């Protein structure tokens, strides 16, 4: 009487909680752990979906909030849905549109009925209810659709956190009932609770009672402490079902990815690679190369001789160093292609080490290259790794 499972576990680390798996979605199989870039082209500065396809990306994020006349998710009235609008043959994960509404507008109010917004020019009100959030996602046809949740700042403390956690449970059940096409789209729940161990445990116990295809860990991209960050992640994965995906939203730093894979997470997203490129910085196994600095002026090697991305096939560090100072826009595009490929290659290398039963050794190699010697790893990541049985040498 159980719903079909979209995830297949290929290998599990004998020490940590690391998992190598496959997502079987309507638009093809996705290898996990997977970083998911933003396929939405709401930015002049970015990477096209055709280039994401060339990099091997088989699932990306896509949303329509940036379209239309008013803020909030928008219907596109396209025959082929958001896949046709994006020209994307692969998998799409679509947000609810609620986080962007309460975060960017800042004039929105959250009630039990949904997210409300009074127009700036005339005061016309747009209400984003769980019914309306799912009806839009059904029309977009995305492969994975996210629950509309009551998002609170992780730093904000008080009954508001508990209020949002219970409201997210009530909204989750509203999204389930309103969700047509469960044969084509997978609705994920979002675990709330902020930094409170008892609130998240209540949300974990309650939300896992629903038979949604996947579960997401929300409310942790905020500026909390790294100790509270990894503890809430480990708490979540310790009580989420192992036979279903775990989506940790908003984490993109290389060290945060390796640790949270070791904590049992399967899916990630973050605009960190794009923002890193705009500082003239390229992601490497040792951190990031600040290519604007003149040490690369006559450095004609690629960013990374091991990287397979087109930027490292065609352009050198010197060309990018000069391009950052003569055409900053074109250089941002080349670094964006690389930084996104580094994320893809990092996740692919993590998965290979889990399949080959050498994930703990992979983490030591990663920390040594990232921080000099694995013992120089940040204290918070040492605590998180040791809590699942990975010590650094
Ligand atoms: Br399914
Ligand atoms: Cl990205
Ligand atoms: Cl469902
Ligand atoms: Cl210098
Ligand atoms: Cl050159
Ligand atoms: Cl292993
Ligand atoms: K909009
Ligand atoms: Zn590259």
Residue numbers in the entry: 11 to 403
From the paper:
In contrast to the homodimeric architecture of the bacterial and archeal TGT, the eukaryotic, heterodimeric TGT is composed of a catalytically active queuine tRNA-ribosyltransferase subunit 1 (QTRT1) and a catalytically inactive QTRT2 subunit. Here we report the first crystal structure of the human QTRT1, which is the catalytic subunit of a eukaryotic TGT enzyme. Analysis of the human QTRT1 catalytic subunit reveals the enzyme to possess a bended (α/β) barrel, consisting of an eight stranded β-barrel at the core and eight flanking helices. In addition, the protein contains a Zn2+ binding domain, in which the zinc ion is coordinated by a triangular arrangement of three cysteine residues Cys317, Cys319, and Cys322, while the α-helix bound His248 completes the tetragonal coordination of the metal ion.
Multiple diffraction images datasets of the best diffracting crystal were collected, processed with XDS and subsequently merged with a resolution cutoff at 2.45 Å. The space group was identified to be C2. The crystal’s asymmetric unit comprises two molecules with only one of them (chain A) exhibiting reasonable fit to electron density after initial refinement steps. However, structural analysis of the asymmetric unit’s content revealed both molecules to be the catalytic QTRT1 subunit. Comparison of the human QTRT1 structure with the previously reported structure of its bacterial counterpart from Z. mobilis reveals both proteins to share a fairly similar fold with a root-mean-square deviation (RMSD) of 2.86 Å (calculated between all equivalent Cα positions). Differences between both structures were observed in the conformation of the region comprising amino acids 114–138 which adopts a three stranded beta sheet with an extended loop between the β-strands two and three that folds into a more open conformation compared to the bacterial TGT. In the reported QTRT1 structure we observed conserved Asp105 and Asp279, occupying structurally equivalent positions, thus arguing for a conserved catalytic mechanism. As a consequence of the purification strategy, which included a high salt concentration, we did not observe additional electron density in the active site that may correspond to a bound ligand. Furthermore, we do observe a PGA molecule at the interface of the asymmetric units promoting contact of the B-chain with a symmetry mate through stacking between symmetry equivalent Arg184 residues. Therefore, our crystal structure supports previous observations that QTRT1 is mainly monomeric in solution, and the dimer architecture we observe in the asymmetric unit is likely caused by crystal packing.
